[PDB]
Every structure is written in C-alpha cells, then in structure tokens.
Amino acid sequence: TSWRSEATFQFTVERFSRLSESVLSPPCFVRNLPWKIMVMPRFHQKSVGFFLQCNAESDSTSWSCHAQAVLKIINYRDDEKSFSRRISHLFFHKENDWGFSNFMAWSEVTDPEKGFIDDDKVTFEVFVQADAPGGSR
C-alpha cells in the first residue's frame, strides 16, 4: 500500500491562531517514501507557510522523486472556496521539501468569517503524485 503512486492526506493544526512555530504531520507513504505536511507562520504582514516534505529523515543521498501536488487549505463551509495551489518538483536529499512561504495570508485564514478556521482548527490537505524508476515498457 506504500507503493502507490498517489494519495491524498490531511493534517489538522489545532490552536492555530497561537501557532508561533513550525509543526509537522505524521507521514503518508507514496512510492515507498514518507511524505509530510509542514506548516508555520512566516514574517507586519504575516503569512501561512505550507510545504510538502519528502523522506527528510533518511540518511540516503541517492533517492529522488519527481512529484506534482495540490497543496490545499480546506474551507469547512464552502468547499468551492477551499484555497489551493499546485507545485511540481524533484524531491531529493538537498531539496526534500517544497511549497509556499507565502501560501496564504494569516489574517485571511484566521478570519472566523472566511470559513478556513473552525474552533481555532485549520485543516491542510495535500494530493501528491510521484513518479518512480521502471522499465521503458
């Protein structure tokens, strides 16, 4: 099941408005690699840093995964309004994570009227598709 080429997994960050540091989600396996969502506030204009991390703990320096993904902050009210952005990147030991330091504006995601924050909880979602070595077929 960890050999799959794609997957969609979520990560909820509680007490979000108080977040003053980086938090990391448990791994989700795709192409036998552990993928994670990394979140953190970035700096008077504050923004949400949202990144996709792949196999960062590995000592190995010969692994690589070409992947495209949809980094999305879910909107509890109107899904049509779920905020998402796409990435494409070659993950490997020197660049094991990719995303947006200015994914979205802190004031907007933490606005109780915008639909992204509920009971101070914000949910992140990532749909990732990764390649893998194989024959030409």
Numbering used by the authors: 63 to 105, 111 to 204
Task: Reproduce text from the manuscript describing this model.
Herpesvirus-associated ubiquitin-specific protease (HAUSP, also known as USP7), a deubiquitylating enzyme of the ubiquitin-specific processing protease family, specifically deubiquitylates both p53 and MDM2, hence playing an important yet enigmatic role in the p53–MDM2 pathway. Here we demonstrate that both p53 and MDM2 specifically recognize the N-terminal tumor necrosis factor–receptor associated factor (TRAF)–like domain of HAUSP in a mutually exclusive manner. The crystal structures of the HAUSP TRAF-like domain in complex with p53 and MDM2 peptides, determined at 2.3-Å and 1.7-Å resolutions, respectively, reveal that the MDM2 peptide recognizes the same surface groove in HAUSP as that recognized by p53 but mediates more extensive interactions. Structure-based sequence alignment of the three HAUSP-binding peptides revealed a conserved four-residue binding motif with the consensus sequence of (Ø/E)-G-(Ø/G)-S, where Ø denotes a non-polar residue.
